[PDB]
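Lecture notes, part 5. Sequence design as translation. It can be helpful to think of inverse folding as translation between two languages: the language of shapes and the language of residues. The source text, in C-alpha coordinates, appears below.
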Protein backbone atom coordinates (compact mmCIF):
# COMPACT_ATOMS: atom_id res chain seq x y z
CA UNK A 1 0.00 0.00 0.00
CA UNK A 2 2.93 2.32 0.71
CA UNK A 3 5.78 1.84 -1.77
CA UNK A 4 8.48 3.54 -3.77
CA UNK A 5 7.11 3.74 -7.30
CA UNK A 6 8.81 4.71 -10.54
CA UNK A 7 7.64 8.11 -11.85
CA UNK A 8 4.69 8.08 -14.26
CA UNK A 9 5.42 11.62 -15.42
CA UNK A 10 8.73 13.35 -15.94
CA UNK A 11 9.45 17.04 -16.42
CA UNK A 12 12.23 16.66 -18.95
CA UNK A 13 12.82 20.36 -19.56
CA UNK A 14 13.43 23.02 -20.31
CA UNK A 15 16.06 24.51 -17.98
CA UNK A 16 15.07 28.07 -17.01
CA UNK A 17 11.57 27.53 -18.37
CA UNK A 18 10.24 27.19 -14.84
CA UNK A 19 10.72 23.48 -14.10
CA UNK A 20 11.12 23.88 -10.31
CA UNK A 21 8.06 26.15 -10.07
CA UNK A 22 6.00 23.72 -12.13
CA UNK A 23 6.99 20.79 -9.94
CA UNK A 24 6.26 22.65 -6.70
CA UNK A 25 2.85 23.76 -7.95
CA UNK A 26 1.81 20.31 -9.18
CA UNK A 27 2.76 19.09 -5.71
CA UNK A 28 -0.21 21.09 -4.44
CA UNK A 29 -2.38 18.28 -5.83
CA UNK A 30 -3.12 15.62 -3.16
CA UNK A 31 -2.39 12.79 -5.61
CA UNK A 32 1.02 14.11 -6.69
CA UNK A 33 4.28 13.19 -4.96
CA UNK A 34 7.51 14.82 -6.10
CA UNK A 35 10.89 13.12 -6.21
CA UNK A 36 13.31 15.05 -3.97
CA UNK A 37 16.00 16.91 -5.92
CA UNK A 38 17.36 15.84 -9.30
CA UNK A 39 18.66 12.26 -9.33
CA UNK A 40 20.40 12.37 -12.72
CA UNK A 41 19.68 8.78 -13.67
CA UNK A 42 19.29 8.62 -17.45
CA UNK A 43 21.87 11.32 -18.22
CA UNK A 44 24.65 9.73 -16.15
CA UNK A 45 26.28 6.44 -17.23
CA UNK A 46 27.63 5.77 -13.74
CA UNK A 47 24.17 5.95 -12.16
CA UNK A 48 22.34 4.43 -15.12
CA UNK A 49 24.58 1.41 -14.67
CA UNK A 50 23.21 0.74 -11.18
CA UNK A 51 19.90 -0.29 -12.76
CA UNK A 52 16.22 0.66 -12.58
CA UNK A 53 15.89 -0.64 -9.02
CA UNK A 54 18.48 1.79 -7.65
CA UNK A 55 16.45 4.53 -9.35
CA UNK A 56 13.18 3.22 -7.94
CA UNK A 57 14.55 3.23 -4.37
CA UNK A 58 15.59 6.86 -4.74
CA UNK A 59 11.90 7.72 -5.10
CA UNK A 60 9.72 8.74 -2.14
CA UNK A 61 7.11 6.38 -0.69
CA UNK A 62 3.59 6.77 -2.09
CA UNK A 63 0.18 5.10 -2.37
CA UNK A 64 -1.16 3.12 -5.39
CA UNK A 65 -3.45 5.94 -6.52
CA UNK A 66 -0.63 8.50 -6.54
CA UNK A 67 1.58 9.61 -9.38
CA UNK A 68 5.25 10.32 -8.77
CA UNK A 69 6.82 13.10 -10.81
CA UNK A 70 10.53 13.60 -11.36
CA UNK A 71 12.13 16.84 -12.54
CA UNK A 72 15.31 16.67 -14.63
CA UNK A 73 15.97 19.67 -16.99
CA UNK A 74 19.19 18.21 -18.44
CA UNK A 75 17.22 15.28 -19.93
CA UNK A 76 15.84 17.51 -22.70
CA UNK A 77 19.26 18.05 -24.33
CA UNK A 78 21.22 14.87 -23.43
CA UNK A 79 21.26 12.73 -26.58
CA UNK A 80 20.93 9.30 -24.94
CA UNK A 81 18.09 9.92 -22.45
CA UNK A 82 15.09 9.34 -24.79
CA UNK A 83 15.94 5.72 -25.62
CA UNK A 84 16.73 4.88 -22.02
CA UNK A 85 13.50 6.29 -20.67
CA UNK A 86 11.62 4.65 -23.54
CA UNK A 87 13.03 1.26 -22.58
CA UNK A 88 12.10 1.69 -18.93
CA UNK A 89 8.49 2.74 -19.71
CA UNK A 90 7.31 3.47 -23.26
CA UNK A 91 3.95 4.82 -22.02
CA UNK A 92 5.45 7.36 -19.64
CA UNK A 93 4.07 10.90 -19.72
CA UNK A 94 6.42 13.77 -20.47
CA UNK A 95 6.11 17.41 -19.45
CA UNK A 96 7.99 20.22 -21.15
CA UNK A 97 7.86 23.77 -19.81
CA UNK A 98 9.08 26.58 -22.04
CA UNK A 99 9.12 30.33 -22.23
CA UNK A 100 10.11 32.99 -24.75
CA UNK A 101 13.32 31.60 -26.41
CA UNK A 102 15.43 34.76 -26.21
CA UNK A 103 14.42 35.35 -22.59
CA UNK A 104 15.18 31.73 -21.71
CA UNK A 105 18.59 32.04 -23.37
CA UNK A 106 19.43 35.11 -21.32
CA UNK A 107 18.26 33.38 -18.14
CA UNK A 108 20.49 30.42 -19.05
CA UNK A 109 23.41 32.80 -19.61
CA UNK A 110 22.70 34.57 -16.31
CA UNK A 111 22.98 31.38 -14.29
CA UNK A 112 26.26 30.42 -15.99
CA UNK A 113 27.52 33.94 -15.31
CA UNK A 114 26.63 33.75 -11.61
CA UNK A 115 28.39 30.39 -11.38
CA UNK A 116 31.65 31.89 -12.62
CA UNK A 117 31.52 35.03 -10.47
CA UNK A 118 30.98 32.82 -7.43
CA UNK A 119 34.27 31.10 -8.22
CA UNK A 120 35.69 34.55 -9.03
CA UNK A 121 36.27 33.96 -12.75
CA UNK A 122 35.84 35.95 -15.97
CA UNK A 123 33.16 35.76 -18.66
CA UNK A 124 31.87 37.73 -21.64
CA UNK A 125 28.69 39.73 -22.17
CA UNK A 126 25.73 37.79 -23.54
CA UNK A 127 26.13 39.59 -26.87
CA UNK A 128 29.73 38.47 -27.40
CA UNK A 129 28.59 34.88 -26.92
CA UNK A 130 25.28 34.86 -28.78
CA UNK A 131 26.46 36.77 -31.83
CA UNK A 132 29.24 35.88 -34.26
CA UNK A 133 31.54 38.94 -34.25
CA UNK A 134 32.39 38.59 -37.95
CA UNK A 135 29.06 37.86 -39.67
CA UNK A 136 27.04 39.64 -36.98
CA UNK A 137 24.56 36.74 -37.09
CA UNK A 138 23.33 34.40 -34.35
CA UNK A 139 25.95 31.99 -32.96
CA UNK A 140 24.22 28.61 -33.22
CA UNK A 141 27.10 26.83 -31.44
CA UNK A 142 26.25 28.60 -28.17
CA UNK A 143 24.27 26.21 -25.94
CA UNK A 144 22.08 28.94 -24.42
CA UNK A 145 20.85 29.61 -27.97
CA UNK A 146 20.76 25.96 -29.08
CA UNK A 147 18.78 24.93 -26.00
CA UNK A 148 16.15 27.52 -26.97
CA UNK A 149 15.60 25.92 -30.37
CA UNK A 150 12.90 23.79 -28.77
CA UNK A 151 11.84 22.14 -32.00
CA UNK A 152 15.26 20.56 -32.64
CA UNK A 153 15.20 18.72 -29.32
CA UNK A 154 11.55 17.74 -29.42
CA UNK A 155 12.26 16.08 -32.80
CA UNK A 156 14.70 13.69 -31.12
CA UNK A 157 12.15 12.78 -28.47
CA UNK A 158 9.47 12.17 -31.09
CA UNK A 159 11.63 9.36 -32.49
CA UNK A 160 10.59 7.37 -29.41
CA UNK A 161 7.34 8.84 -28.09
CA UNK A 162 4.11 9.83 -29.89
CA UNK A 163 3.27 13.54 -29.54
CA UNK A 164 0.22 12.47 -27.47
CA UNK A 165 2.49 11.53 -24.52
CA UNK A 166 3.87 15.06 -24.26
CA UNK A 167 2.28 18.13 -22.72
CA UNK A 168 3.73 21.60 -23.20
CA UNK A 169 3.37 24.06 -20.33
CA UNK A 170 3.41 27.78 -21.21
CA UNK A 171 6.06 29.04 -18.82
CA UNK A 172 5.37 32.70 -19.56
CA UNK A 173 1.73 32.17 -18.54
CA UNK A 174 2.81 30.08 -15.54
CA UNK A 175 4.43 33.24 -14.28
CA UNK A 176 1.52 35.64 -14.97
CA UNK A 177 -1.60 33.43 -14.62
CA UNK A 178 -0.76 29.91 -13.26
CA UNK A 179 -4.05 28.16 -12.50
CA UNK A 180 -5.17 27.57 -16.13
CA UNK A 181 -1.82 26.00 -17.04
CA UNK A 182 -1.92 23.75 -13.97
CA UNK A 183 -5.47 22.73 -14.80
CA UNK A 184 -4.40 21.50 -18.22
CA UNK A 185 -1.65 19.44 -16.56
CA UNK A 186 -4.26 17.93 -14.25
CA UNK A 187 -6.29 16.68 -17.20
CA UNK A 188 -3.19 15.51 -19.04
CA UNK A 189 -2.33 13.37 -15.99
CA UNK A 190 -5.91 12.08 -15.65
CA UNK A 191 -6.18 13.73 -12.24
CA UNK A 192 -9.38 15.26 -10.85
CA UNK A 193 -9.30 19.06 -10.35
CA UNK A 194 -7.97 19.88 -6.87
CA UNK A 195 -5.54 22.77 -7.17
CA UNK A 196 -7.44 26.01 -6.54
CA UNK A 197 -6.92 29.76 -6.65
CA UNK A 198 -6.64 29.65 -2.87
CA UNK A 199 -3.38 27.71 -3.30
CA UNK A 200 -1.69 30.52 -5.25
CA UNK A 201 -1.20 34.15 -4.18
CA UNK A 202 0.71 36.99 -5.83
CA UNK A 203 3.75 38.38 -4.01
CA UNK A 204 4.38 41.88 -5.39
CA UNK A 205 7.69 41.98 -3.50
CA UNK A 206 9.24 38.86 -5.06
CA UNK A 207 7.45 39.59 -8.33
CA UNK A 208 6.13 36.03 -8.64
CA UNK A 209 3.35 33.82 -7.31
CA UNK A 210 3.99 31.86 -4.10
CA UNK A 211 2.32 28.72 -2.77
CA UNK A 212 -0.27 28.70 0.00
CA UNK A 213 -0.70 25.29 1.64
CA UNK A 214 -2.52 25.46 4.98
CA UNK A 215 -3.87 28.41 6.98
CA UNK A 216 -0.45 29.44 8.28
CA UNK A 217 1.81 27.89 5.64
CA UNK A 218 3.05 29.91 2.66
CA UNK A 219 5.99 28.96 0.44
CA UNK A 220 7.88 30.93 -2.19
CA UNK A 221 10.51 29.46 -4.50
CA UNK A 222 14.28 29.83 -4.05
CA UNK A 223 17.83 36.32 -10.75
CA UNK A 224 18.79 39.84 -11.87
CA UNK A 225 19.04 39.63 -15.65
CA UNK A 226 21.53 41.69 -17.67
CA UNK A 227 20.36 44.41 -20.03
CA UNK A 228 20.88 43.22 -23.59
CA UNK A 229 21.47 45.41 -26.63
CA UNK A 230 17.99 45.89 -28.19
CA UNK A 231 19.63 45.14 -31.53
CA UNK A 232 20.84 41.72 -30.42
CA UNK A 233 17.43 40.97 -28.92
CA UNK A 234 15.91 41.73 -32.33
CA UNK A 235 18.25 39.41 -34.23
CA UNK A 236 17.59 36.55 -31.82
CA UNK A 237 13.81 37.00 -32.05
CA UNK A 238 13.91 36.84 -35.85
CA UNK A 239 16.24 33.82 -35.68
CA UNK A 240 13.89 31.78 -33.43
CA UNK A 241 10.72 32.86 -35.24
CA UNK A 242 10.66 30.03 -37.79
CA UNK A 243 11.62 27.42 -35.18
CA UNK A 244 8.89 28.83 -32.93
CA UNK A 245 6.29 28.37 -35.69
CA UNK A 246 7.42 24.79 -36.17
CA UNK A 247 7.09 24.27 -32.42
CA UNK A 248 3.48 25.54 -32.33
CA UNK A 249 2.57 23.38 -35.32
CA UNK A 250 4.02 20.19 -33.86
CA UNK A 251 2.69 20.66 -30.31
CA UNK A 252 -0.65 22.18 -31.23
CA UNK A 253 -0.01 25.04 -28.79
CA UNK A 254 0.51 28.56 -30.09
CA UNK A 255 2.51 30.49 -27.49
CA UNK A 256 2.67 33.93 -29.12
CA UNK A 257 6.34 34.67 -28.76
CA UNK A 258 7.68 37.99 -30.11
N1 LIG B 1 6.55 31.19 -8.99
C1 LIG B 1 7.77 31.34 -9.51
N2 LIG B 1 8.78 31.70 -8.69
C2 LIG B 1 10.01 31.86 -9.22
N3 LIG B 1 10.40 31.72 -10.49
C3 LIG B 1 9.37 31.37 -11.28
C4 LIG B 1 8.06 31.16 -10.88
N4 LIG B 1 7.28 30.73 -11.94
C5 LIG B 1 8.13 30.67 -12.95
N5 LIG B 1 9.41 31.04 -12.62
C6 LIG B 1 10.57 31.08 -13.51
O1 LIG B 1 11.30 29.90 -13.34
C7 LIG B 1 12.63 30.13 -13.85
C8 LIG B 1 13.57 29.05 -13.36
O2 LIG B 1 13.44 27.88 -14.18
P1 LIG B 1 14.14 26.47 -13.73
O3 LIG B 1 13.56 26.14 -12.37
O4 LIG B 1 13.76 25.47 -14.80
O5 LIG B 1 15.63 26.74 -13.68
C9 LIG B 1 12.94 31.55 -13.37
O6 LIG B 1 13.78 32.18 -14.33
P2 LIG B 1 14.54 33.55 -13.95
O7 LIG B 1 15.35 33.25 -12.71
O8 LIG B 1 15.39 33.88 -15.16
O9 LIG B 1 13.43 34.58 -13.71
C10 LIG B 1 11.56 32.24 -13.29
O10 LIG B 1 11.38 33.21 -14.30
Amino acid sequence: SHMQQLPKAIIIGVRKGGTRALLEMLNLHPAVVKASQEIHFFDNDENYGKGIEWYRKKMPFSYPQQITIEKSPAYFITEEVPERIYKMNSSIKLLIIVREPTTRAISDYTQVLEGKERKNKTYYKFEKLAIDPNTCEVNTKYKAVRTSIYTKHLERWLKYFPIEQFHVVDGDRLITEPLPELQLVEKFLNLPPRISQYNLYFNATRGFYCLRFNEIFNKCLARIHPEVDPSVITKLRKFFHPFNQKFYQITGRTLNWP
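The translated text above is only one of many valid answers, since several sequences can fold into similar shapes. The chain is about 40% helix and 15% strand.
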